[PDB]
Design a protein around this ligand. Sequence first.
Ligand SMILES: CN1c2c(nc(N)[nH]c2=O)NC[C@@H]1CNc1ccc(C(=O)N[C@@H](CCC(=O)O)C(=O)O)cc1
Length: 385
Amino acid sequence: SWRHLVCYLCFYGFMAQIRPGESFITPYLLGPDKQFTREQVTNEITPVLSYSYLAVLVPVFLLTDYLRYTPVLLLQGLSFVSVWLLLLLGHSVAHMQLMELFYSVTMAARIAYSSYIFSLVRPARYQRVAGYSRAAVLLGVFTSSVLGQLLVTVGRVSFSTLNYISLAFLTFSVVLALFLKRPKSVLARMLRELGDSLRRPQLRLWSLWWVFNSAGYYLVVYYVHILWNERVYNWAADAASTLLGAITSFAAGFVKIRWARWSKLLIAGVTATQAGLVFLLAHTRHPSSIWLCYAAFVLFRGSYQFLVPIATFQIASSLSKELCALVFGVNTFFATIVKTIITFIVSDVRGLGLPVRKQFQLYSVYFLILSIIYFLGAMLDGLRH
Ligand SMILES: CN1c2c(nc(N)[nH]c2=O)NC[C@@H]1CNc1ccc(C(=O)N[C@@H](CCC(=O)O)C(=O)O)cc1
């Protein structure tokens, strides 16, 4: 299986992220297809995603490496199929809450594929496979967005037919996941090994990056989404951003930079670049600079997605046991915790309610201080002689 091991896995990663009808879930609900209201979707349906995500991210990471990453990938595929079954056949708001819960389950289980990538290949070329995997996933997301948008805009396709197409694609993704090769008080032993592994320098630094920079990137992405929502150029920017992320993840898969040294400077410079990109993003105004702003966000996802195929790799090379998925899940869970803490701090009305521009200035400052802390840490241990 020289061709059936990593090529097939990246093929499945690409085809499992194809969902032409995913990007139009809201407008499909708000129309002469479900007869929903904006208030119903934005109170009783959308927050169910957040509730379920920061509840189901825990068991998924806790047991995902125990059952060898294949059954939970099949569960993610079946959960996408269940999401689209609820979408095609759902009237009460309870069914849409169930659909949001299942979509949250898939979002939680993405880490399972992220770690199954490392569980398959031999622990030597981890980086070159992480890059390929992230590139395949981002190509899948970009293809899904492009296909859905061109099907609804260039062609004349009703949302029902698009959702049927997406259901067929998800069924094929489940069929593809069926054939994946399954690799070879447990909680106390796992926690002890987790604490033992966190003492390593590279794993510690990159886990901190995943906890903080990923949370910042999620916050920035969601708030650019709401800011642009608050039109064809929106999908154009999102698709271009995903494409640049895929290209940069492939490049990171090809990167040869040493990691014992010349690594903290790398993360510091990448985070500083992200801070500058958000800095430019916040202060765009009525003039055509918005177009230039449209580029900056793309470069934003051209930076964070340049480090995920590296970070995961650098965590896969520092975990002696087969706990490469528990650490990824802990990092994602804590990133979600940090993101929701910040959202409670600023986004909510009961919190420090500020305009979106103020939020983006605050995120620029937060990325800048993260990069400054990383730079200070790099300089503190620079000599050690
Ligand atoms: C279905 N969800 C939803 C909706 N719209 C409504 N009205 N209700 C919903 O529940 N639109 C899609 C949304 C899903 N929300 C999200 C949240 C995060 C990501 C997300 O993780 N995007 C990745 C892109 C790359 C990838 O998929 O791996 C990211 O980097 O943020 C996707 C959808």
